[PDB]
Design a protein around this nucleic acid. Structure first.
Lengths: 165, 213, 213, 165
DNA sequence: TCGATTCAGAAT
DNA sequence: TCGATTCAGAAT
């Protein structure tokens, strides 16, 4: 449960109860500088097997071409509120998340955190697979678009990988 | 762990500055955000921007259901050496009797947006924090997160200019911890932070303060 | 775990007989010692030696600092259905006020000998046990062992003739548990066993009995 | 710590405190019917390397020849005492143990337990090695004699192994 | 595998 | 390795 792949269940929003159980996977794109780990493996393996076609990469490359805003551009903002809690000033930290559900049940989430060790932000992609649910083809394509809309760093990393295959 | 002690009429605690993955880490603010600092590779500035450097300490009150840990150790030593008086503790408990709204009452919520990211739905998770600047320079923070219900954590941020030795113009030493004399108002404000953080925290402060009175 | 319930004015518990490595195991005495029994390979006798067969149950009172486990569940149900009366509990607490020596006071000791085994020194480790036969047939045992100070454990041994169904002349079934109607005197004698076992156990019995009165 | 090899320390009888720390080893003689595991390995390996000589096996075989009483013969006895603890009869269970200290510091203990699953007894040999302390030659020989004085079953098993080498 | 127990281990 | 935390794992 302490890995990037862990099983959780929906309780208070955070038999037929087996739909509430899902696997959360903190999925990566690259490792060791080369694009042959997790997602980049699925994508190349599917592109080699004809599961992903030549036209499938254009749609992703063209879609990447059209993208200007990214999730990290929203950033984390600490908003002042005019409230006082017995001499303590109250604020609100606004974290932005992008969510997308797939017809088969799987969710894709992209969350933002303050860039550790550096100044800026760090974005991460998650896939939540129900225990009632193998990788659908549309899953692989939305995971790529997840990384393409996360940050320009991740987008340039995805664009660079697609032109290779 | 930080060392708590009593010397020359003051409660002092020794704060390690080379454990950046602990609950005690040295930060420096760049344009309003805190960024962690490699205290062994980057050598501290010898100028005014040294005030922008600080120690962020996630301070706790209880451990294993006992009040013999960090803030509870500072308050008890302060009590035993007359640093924290009877009226000091009395005013706190009368303050606790008057506190009736808490930081955890604000909750955490996920807000829908009119915004979309190329087919991806966009949400805003809104988290409440409480911050207080003290005249002595320190900041006290209370942030709310989800219980791994809610759990609230108290932070105290100590400017590097408020500790000795002076790290100006030098790099931290191996396993270097640093001496910090705790002002009495900070101990009181820290107990206040726990009182208003949540009702659960308040009952711990009240139950502990009543035991030493 | 054993199932505790209430049916037809009796506290009954269901005892599994095919878990020989649990705290509930079926034994048969051969010449005064208890020997475990494979209840799924060896088929029980259809005769008088069936009384020599019994269920040995290491019964506990508390779990996780709460009194909602085994004997405490039997006593509370017995309380709620008037099986254990006010005077029943009152006599027990007055018995506890009178108990002042405990089984753990006997201790465990290693005794030196005048005996030697071909160059090997010989010692005798002497462990105290308490045993009581009840007119209904059951035996109650208290043995003392070293804390893994001392810790004392209570056993209750239930003859197979005291449970249903009758296993005479047949082998146990897969995952078979067995129904045992608990006499009220046994619940009282079990609470007595914990009272005299140790002062620590007694305070648990006293503190629990006072809460339901 | 849950293995047959675990580290303990002497506290209340059960810097210079490092002498109180020792390794307890529940040591076996045979495994899988053949005498090539733990002790039987040490003994054969030492006998092959000349560490154990031909005369060393006679002393053990002759000593085994002279042995008649065994630790299991003492058994576990439940002794009645004439005491009553508020209506509860008090007894004493007398477990017999054989102990032997070696000049280098190591202790050898043999303890008795009711034969699990069967009627009778089961004996086991332990060696307690101080953390301040490699196998001394005299250690191997007293371990064998430990098994030879434990029970006739263990003795016949040791005697059978020594005649093979 | 269950059964018992609590430590050490995996996780990043 | 430390640091944080709690689960699952090794043990027989």
């Amino acid at each position: 449960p302490t890995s990037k792949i862990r099983v959780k269940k929906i309780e208070n929003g955070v038999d037929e109860n087996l739909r509430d159980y899902y696997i959360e996977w903190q999925i990566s794109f690259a490792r060791d500088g080369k694009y042959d780990y997790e997602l980049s493996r699925m994508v190349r393996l599917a592109h080699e097997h004809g599961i992903l076609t030549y036209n499938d990469i254009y749609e992703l490359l063209k879609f990447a071409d059209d993208v200007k805003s990214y999730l990290e551009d929203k950033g984390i903002r600490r908003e002042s509120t005019n409230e006082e809690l017995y001499g303590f000033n109250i604020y609100e930290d606004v974290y932005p998340v992008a969510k997308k559900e797939l017809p088969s049940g799987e969710f894709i989430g992209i969350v933002l955190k303050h860039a550790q060790r550096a100044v800026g932000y760090q974005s991460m992609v998650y896939v939540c697979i129900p225990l009632t649910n193998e990788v659908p083809v549309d899953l692989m394509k939305e995971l790529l678009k997840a990384f393409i809309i996360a940050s320009e760093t991740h987008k340039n990393d995805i664009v660079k990988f697609l032109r290779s295959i | 762990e930080a060392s708590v002690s009593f010397e020359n009429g003051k409660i002092v605690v020794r704060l390690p500055i080379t454990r950046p993955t602990s609950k005690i880490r040295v930060k420096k603010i760049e344009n309003g955000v805190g960024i962690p600092v490699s205290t062994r590779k980057k050598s501290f500035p010898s100028d005014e921007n040294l005030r922008d450097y600080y120690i962020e300490w996630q301070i706790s009150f209880a451990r294993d259901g006992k009040y013999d840990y960090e803030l509870s150790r500072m308050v008890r030593l302060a009590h035993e050496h007359g640093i924290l008086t009877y009226n000091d503790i009395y005013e706190l408990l009368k303050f606790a009797d008057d506190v009736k709204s808490y930081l955890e009452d604000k909750g955490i919520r996920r807000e829908s947006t009119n915004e979309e990211l190329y087919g991806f739905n966009i949400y805003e998770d809104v988290y409440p924090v409480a911050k207080k600047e003290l005249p002595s320079g320190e900041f006290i923070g209370i942030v709310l997160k989800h219980a791994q219900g809610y759990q609230s954590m108290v932070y105290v941020c100590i400017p590097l200019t408020n500790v000795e030795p002076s790290l100006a113009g030098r790099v931290a030493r191996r396993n270097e911890v640093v001496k910090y004399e705790v002002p009495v108002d900070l101990m009181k404000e820290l107990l206040k932070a726990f009182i208003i953080a949540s009702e659960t925290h308040k009952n711990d402060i009240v139950k502990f303060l009543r035991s030493i009175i």
